[PDB]
Symmetry: C2
């Protein structure tokens, strides 16, 4: 009750004010733990009340920070898990087959235990996601290869550190200005023994002619295979497409969102202009419009491969993955 | 003269029966020497008769072997030299300026010495073409580059040997089947300490993703910037264009032919089917049509740069060079 309410309020305020969990996996774990706490603590008779309350909590969580899709992704995953559990315990996708062939009020005592067990299994699968993704590094990196990365991605870092145990290759890291987080990635990879280069975004095209493949992370994967990545990733994808350089996205399955690129102006995250133009400029700040978008939209035609904890896939298959994770009625939430 | 006639017939028969000067520079030199001998020995009262006889032997030379454009190029160069000498001695290109603003057969008794001097100057300029092309190797090759070649080109071999004195790089040579002359090129490049790889044509598109730039020779440069090259160069150029890999053609100026790619079915050189399918196959040779084209047509849009003894040019400028070498009335010959 009070503990649950204060935990929810703290989570919402942390999302609204930023900071909190740097790791996306940590954010997913905290979201799942909070959802489990709501399921255990909150009182509900039938599954319909659970749907309504989880939907309200997820709506509040995503309204706190719409650019943080992992929270909504986990909320929809929990809703799908609850729906599947109810269908298994009570009963026995839209398609041409279903179209040709063709009630949550009922109550069950053991449904809650099954829901918690499924959520715990999901958490266990989430725990080993990074190792599962990194275990595929040797199948995609050959000897004396050149890899291009932008910003700081922990999944890509684990990928490269696992590949470096048996192969020698070069990694080029482009800083993601203004938050030049690529410097930390470069120094980490150098500490791991990999030979690394640090450069600004302005050189992304210039050196792309000498890059064998591009390995990047993302914040979100849309239903059509599009990316909500850090800013400057669209230019990197365009430069890779110019040279037909394969672009690999190493992203866990919990970053898949059933949304579509129809949404406008809430996609990119806009922050204080101080990052781009300092406050000490003076009077010219009065008449100059300064905008600092954090995220970028990447169309699916610029992506070659998705590597996740379940293996490799093409963007054209992303829809099927989206069909296996979320019910079509939970996209609106 | 009888000796001149026997030399002309020897040249014509050598062209018809194949072989002869292995290097294109040697055959250009031989053509220029033969033209000089014809000019000296034959009796001509005025410039028009000299033009007519030059055109007659040029027609015979070109009809001996149409696929060898160097002979016709030298004949047309001599004709343009005669035109410019007669115009400078006697008097003072179709353009809008000439159109808005708007004859031979007048004997002068001083044109022959000028013609011979210009021919000798052309010969001296022809002697040092390969060194002039090779001197620009360092401006186009950087450290630890990957270069790709097809067949055996002496100009490209000189290019790479000159570049290898100061930089270290890798060279991949694709054998030009059936006449696998790329083996000779790879062995020669390995003799100079360059790390080299031998592979077949079928692997070209397989390795273009790891190639930085493609440096090739050619047999002929057409008026629009197209190429007559060894068979397999068109697919190599298409593969380079797929990856936006810069394709450099190292070809001297005497390989520029003022004809257009309108001509068909005589562009390629069809040789005996023994090179592709051996005679020992037996009865199946009765009902199998096997063709062995020696040359390939490369459209101008697949060529990035032309490196010649006068420097680097784009294909879009080739027309101007044509207008600087040949008179438009000598294109038909």
């Amino acid at each position: 009750g009070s503990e649950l309410s204060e935990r929810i309020e703290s989570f919402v305020e942390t999302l609204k004010r930023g900071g909190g969990p740097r790791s996306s996996e940590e954010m997913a774990r905290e979201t799942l733990g909070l959802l489990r706490q709501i399921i255990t603590d909150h009182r509900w008779s039938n599954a319909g009340e659970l749907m309504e309350l989880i939907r309200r909590e997820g709506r509040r969580m995503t309204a706190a920070q719409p650019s943080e899709t992992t929270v909504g992704n986990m909320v929809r995953r929990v809703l799908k898990i609850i729906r599947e559990e109810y269908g298994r315990l009570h009963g026995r996708q839209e398609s041409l087959h279903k179209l040709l062939t063709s009630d949550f009020s009922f109550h069950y005592a053991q449904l809650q235990s099954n829901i918690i067990e499924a959520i715990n299994e999901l958490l266990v699968e989430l725990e080993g996601t990074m190792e599962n993704i990194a275990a595929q590094a040797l199948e995609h990196i050959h000897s004396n290869e050149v890899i291009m990365t932008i910003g700081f991605s922990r999944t890509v870092e684990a990928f490269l550190k696992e590949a470096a145990r048996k192969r020698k290759f070069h990694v080029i890291v482009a800083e993601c200005a203004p938050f030049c987080q690529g410097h930390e990635m470069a120094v980490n990879l150098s500490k791991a023994g990999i030979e690394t280069t640090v450069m600004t975004d302005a050189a992304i095209f210039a050196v792309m002619s000498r890059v064998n493949k591009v390995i990047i992370g993302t914040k979100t994967i849309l239903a059509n295979g599009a990316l909500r990545a850090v800013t400057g990733t669209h230019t990197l994808a365009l430069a890779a497409k110019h040279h037909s350089t394969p672009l690999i996205v190493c992203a866990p399955m919990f970053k898949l969102s059933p949304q579509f690129p129809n949404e406008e102006d809430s996609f990119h995250k806009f922050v204080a202009p101080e990052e781009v133009l300092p406050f000490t400029e003076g009077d010219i700040l009065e008449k100059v419009s300064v905008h600092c978008p954090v995220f970028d939209y990447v169309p699916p035609e610029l992506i070659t491969l998705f590597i996740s904890n379940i293996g490799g896939n093409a963007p054209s298959y992303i829809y099927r993955l989206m069909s296996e994770l979320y019910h079509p009625d939970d996209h609106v939430l």
